[PDB]
């Protein structure tokens, strides 16, 4: 169908109506799920740290399989959580490198979005690259309302019902405004 | 197989669970719904049970078939809906016998006088429906004849009898 246009008007209306109620981007967590480590050592980690500009974190193993995660207590994957300008800067160079125009039926159901394209790492010369060359990615954006912060801390914990809650419509256009293109179909 | 002489009443405590018997043989009745749907008929005729019992798996199938055979030949299966409501759960217990001698008793006194599962039986309480059939008024008279024939094959007796619910 179509999706962008109602979303955009709502978010614009809401800002005018109360300009410290508008939705925001809480974090962008860039991850490689399938792993570069389990049976090898991730040199993709070095590539990720330059790309984010922040320290990445190792990921302990669980369960027993035969692929990845064969024993427990071994690192498997790498992610970095970006917030603020550090996220926005990532998004513009990385989304542009890969494809745009992906369905809002292939994004999350809560106003959230995951991008799914694999291949190409920005920043030459690092993408030739020994030992791991260009690896795959998944980029998640968690969007939330401003008032939730109240819940997160230890004081005045409240789960905010629909009277100020994050609605699926607004979060997608807010991300798109920053850098992004979403297709109409969805 | 013994006769029905303890398989004809409730007298042993409810001990169903296959996690304390560890499995027991399935029902000798292989079919439970027969005929057509229950909305294609107006009226409802039951055979009604008046006495608590345990009725064996063997008696449920004999009773059920004997009704169904007559119903099939005369009426055809274009008409009637016939259901046997109950399901056997009740687990059965027997001391094992081969009537030995010498060192063998069978028996026993004790040296495990305890049960074994030979079957399942259905506990029919007062005011339950042993059989429930749907028919029109036309096809009343076949169902009543089948129903007399069941009533003998019941381990005791009925005294609420061939009962018009009426469903009307």
């Amino acid at each position: 169908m179509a999706v962008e246009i109602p979303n955009k008007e709502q978010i614009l209306a809401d800002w005018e109506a109360h300009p410290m109620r508008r939705p925001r981007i809480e974090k962008v967590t860039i991850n490689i799920g399938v792993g570069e480590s389990g049976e090898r050592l991730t040199k993709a980690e070095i590539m990720l740290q330059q790309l984010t500009g922040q320290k990445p974190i190792r990921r302990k193993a669980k369960k027993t399989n035969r692929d990845f995660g064969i024993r427990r207590g071994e690192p498997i994957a790498v992610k970095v959580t970006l917030r603020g300008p550090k996220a926005y800067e990532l998004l513009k160079r990385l989304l542009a490198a890969v494809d745009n125009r992906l369905k809002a039926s292939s994004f999350d159901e809560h106003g959230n979005v995951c991008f799914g394209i694999e291949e190409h790492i920005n920043i030459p010369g690092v993408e030739y690259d020994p030992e791991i060359g260009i690896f795959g990615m998944d980029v998640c954006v968690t969007l939330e309302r401003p008032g939730f912060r109240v819940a997160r801390r230890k004081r005045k914990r409240a789960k905010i019902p629909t009277r100020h809650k994050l609605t699926k419509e607004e979060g997608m256009v807010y991300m798109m405004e920053e850098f992004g293109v979403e297709i109409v179909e969805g | 197989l013994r006769p029905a002489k303890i398989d004809r009443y409730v007298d042993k405590p409810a001990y169903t669970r296959r996690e304390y018997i560890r499995g027991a043989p399935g029902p000798k009745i292989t079919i439970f719904d027969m005929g057509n749907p229950a909305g294609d008929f107006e009226f409802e005729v039951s055979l009604h049970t008046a006495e608590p019992v345990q009725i064996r798996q063997n008696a449920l199938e004999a009773a059920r078939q004997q009704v169904n055979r007559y119903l099939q030949k005369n009426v055809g299966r274009s008409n009637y809906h016939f259901k046997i409501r109950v399901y056997p759960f009740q687990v059965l217990r027997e001391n094992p016998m081969a009537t030995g001698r010498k060192a063998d008793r069978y028996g026993n006194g004790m040296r495990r006088p305890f049960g074994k599962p030979i079957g399942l039986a259905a506990r029919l309480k007062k005011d339950q429906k042993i059989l429930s059939i749907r028919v029109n008024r036309q096809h009343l008279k076949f169902a009543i004849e089948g129903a007399r024939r069941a009533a003998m094959k019941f381990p005791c007796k009925c005294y609420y009898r061939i009962y018009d619910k009426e469903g009307n």
């Binding site: 230890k154 004081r155 005045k156 914990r157 409240a158 | -």
Partner: protein, 197 residues
Amino acid sequence: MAHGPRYRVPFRRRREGKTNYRKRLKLLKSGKPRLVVRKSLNHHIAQIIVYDPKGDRTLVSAHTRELIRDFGWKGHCGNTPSAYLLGLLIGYKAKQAGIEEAILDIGLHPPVRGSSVFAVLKGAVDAGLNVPHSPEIFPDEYRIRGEHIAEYAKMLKEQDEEKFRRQFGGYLVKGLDPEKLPEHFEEVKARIIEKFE
């Protein structure tokens, strides 16, 4: 608990999301009063509270709303030297409680040095109380005097931006701290007296 009769009892305070039962059970055992210190962004509260199974009774309260009025103190009320001189006011009313025992209920908060709960505690001891702690957790002199903050406050000014002296951010806009002055603290700290002048 949730909907219909299911596992676990509801509780007014689980829903409120306050208190730490574990800590609380431990605290109460001594039979000594709780000084319930709670923190906020621009208020800090201490109250000497006893427990009774019927409702608690509060013997004396003191607020940062009782230090702003009537003691010539402007300050901010979220800052560390407001907590210190709050310890002093509940240090003059703890000599009117007639017992000098005053132990910390922090509700649900972590213990790290340079905190409000330490800052008030720190003011209470000097006020003349005697309490159970082992020291390793008190702020330094620069926090109490109001000097760390003084170095930050001159740096930043509000509705301006510059490169060293009017740079954007909080700096304290008050009639007797326009740039945050440890002179102000020294006057008010001299006001010490149990008659509340």
